[PDB]
Symmetry: C2
Subunit: 371 residues, 2 copies
């Protein structure tokens, strides 16, 4: 309804000029709205909802209208459950596409569809203005902007200002984390008398107190020994949550921190998903990691990478996309009903986190921080 | 002693090859230790502690040895009270010099002086390896590395691993904030039994709950009126602190955030310091601010600027260096015993923070973040 998590396969072959949209509208290329605005003018004049096909994952919340009668404003604000850490504070940008739309009122309104969207971070507020517009129609406005990746993360508020509580109003922030993966955070306006309807999305700091894992000193008690197979799983899925159950493994925290020698293994299970037999849309798993390959020790590069693997159900059998740079693998567990996230113990030191995205649920596992 | 804050004037004239040091060891340039090591090999062999002369401010804490018997290590860690916000993802790099050292014993020890220093930030840990060495002696190693300024801020942990609890062991991180200001954070190892001894360095969120300064509705109850001079001072210096009392003004927060109009003022006082008569070293005040010259809407690059002013006393006459772009100004109060930090109302919107550093006291004032 007015909240949830949905997934889908994205084939730019079908999407009209999809390759171009992804390259000039969802990638920091031309610093002018011109190129992208050209591609959308043509494409969106044919299919107004074309962009939705570029969202591998859609995560939405129902947010109540907030009437600021004093200023005649109707506002919808919400903190998106960003799926993975944005990135290190380096000079690397993400091109975000913002879309504001609504249904066309039965009775022709007096007010024009004016909308202003802003993304604020403690230190700076990024405003989507006319100079950011790349497409505009009666009830849909699309803005484009480049923001340092580190800012697109928990801590960024999205505020949409309108002059009317337009029916079916929604604001979507299209966030590409990779060349082949775009995550769409959506704020769906709901009655101002309703309570917020957040999606089932969670953020879990797996290695809380990254000092306890500094040594093999506690392995035994935390159940992280060659005997336990280094598997101390805990349930992610809440109680009244969908049937599919996800679980995270704490032991990988040792292979990332532990200075003391540790048991060697072919692979580690970062997390697993059960219920694959009932899913109908692809499952997405995205990692955030640093690239081992050392470079200039004097001027170290600290760019955070993101790669998203996609497990799909073809004719009933679940198959995953594979990558060489991507430190994680998606393989089924004992049966088909179970999916596992794997990684070579040798990658943990450089792994920042993995995020699980599937119908009705999103889990952001972090192997850093203490909260 | 084991902790404290000290200040001093810096003249690259009195420092043997200071200009070359600053231009090659404290400025991102050649990405190879070669050029800097050459200078230090010559200069430091003559005066092992020459670098200390480049520190305009030195802030040190006493930190307890922490035994890692398991690995046969002796470690000291500490969260340096970085004086100001380091930068945004859009800032460039800063070339940092890290110094590890100890007293030279009269009796030759079994093992050689060994130290491994790393700077871990929230996500990435920068390790100072042999490839970062620019100078080495029996009991002192100096490393150099370029790091985006954004990382250099509270939340950067300094860890130094030794193999013995060497007497007089200390680690120093030299941080250039401008071409004429360098701040040195020091960790002095103390008894394994002792509690850490941080210096009197605070970080104060002047505008806690920045939204409350959104309009002028409450200016009057809040005690911020043109009639009262827009002054609402709160003591920064703690009860058992040095005689020189420092205070911060909250009223400037309105001028930074208020959407409502505010009374025109010739200037605003951000902070003041009493007791200049008893001071024996210069007083430094550094501002962090944004350039008030708009730019590309499609890619709003928010680059942070730093400018440090110096107030000194020459034969009973306190004079201050004046600066251009520097939005702040240092002037005396009613008496020469008081120093005030002034700013034009117009600059508040772009003012991120101002840091007061003097003998025994350092106050980092932040005009953003309710924390």
């Amino acid at each position: 309804h007015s909240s949830g998590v949905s997934t889908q396969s994205v084939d730019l072959s079908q999407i009209k000029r999809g390759d171009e949209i992804q390259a000039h509208c969802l990638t920091p290329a031309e610093t002018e709205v011109t190129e992208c605005a050209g591609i959308l003018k043509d494409v969106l004049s044919k299919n107004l909802h074309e962009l939705q096909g570029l969202c591998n994952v859609k995560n939405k919340m129902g947010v109540p209208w907030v009437s600021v009668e004093e200023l005649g404003q109707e506002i919808i604000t919400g903190r998106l459950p960003f799926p993975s850490v944005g990135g290190t504070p380096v000079n690397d940008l993400v091109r975000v596409l913002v879309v504001a739309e609504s249904n066309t009122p039965e009775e022709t309104p007096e007010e024009e569809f004016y909308a202003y969207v802003e993304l604020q971070t403690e230190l700076y507020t990024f405003g989507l203005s006319d100079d950011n517009v790349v497409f505009t129609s009666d009830y849909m406005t699309v803005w484009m902007i480049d923001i340092p990746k580190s800012y697109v993360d928990v801590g960024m508020l999205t505020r949409a200002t309108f002059l009317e509580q337009w029916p079916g109003a929604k604001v979507t922030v299209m966030i590409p984390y990779s060349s082949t993966f775009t995550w769409c955070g959506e704020l769906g306006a709901i009655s101002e008398e309703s309570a917020p309807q957040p999606s089932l999305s969670a953020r879990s700091p797996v290695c809380k107190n990254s000092a306890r894992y500094s040594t093999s000193k506690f392995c035994e008690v935390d159940g992280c020994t060659a005997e336990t197979g280094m598997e101390k799983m805990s349930l992610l899925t809440p109680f009244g949550g969908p049937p599919q159950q996800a679980k995270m493994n704490t032991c990988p925290c040792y292979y990332k921190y532990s200075v003391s020698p540790l048991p060697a293994m072919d692979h580690l299970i970062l997390a697993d998903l059960a219920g694959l037999d009932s899913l109908t849309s692809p499952v997405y798993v995205m990692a955030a990691y640093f690239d081992s390959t050392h470079e200039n020790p004097v001027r170290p590069s600290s760019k955070l990478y993101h790669c998203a693997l996609q497990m799909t159900s073809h004719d009933g059998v679940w198959t995953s996309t594979s990558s060489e740079q991507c430190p994680i693998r998606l393989v089924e567990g004992q049966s088909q009903n179970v999916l596992q996230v794997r990684v070579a113990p040798t990658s943990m030191p450089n792994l920042v986190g993995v995020s699980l995205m599937l119908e009705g649920q999103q889990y952001r596992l972090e192997y850093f921080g203490d909260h």
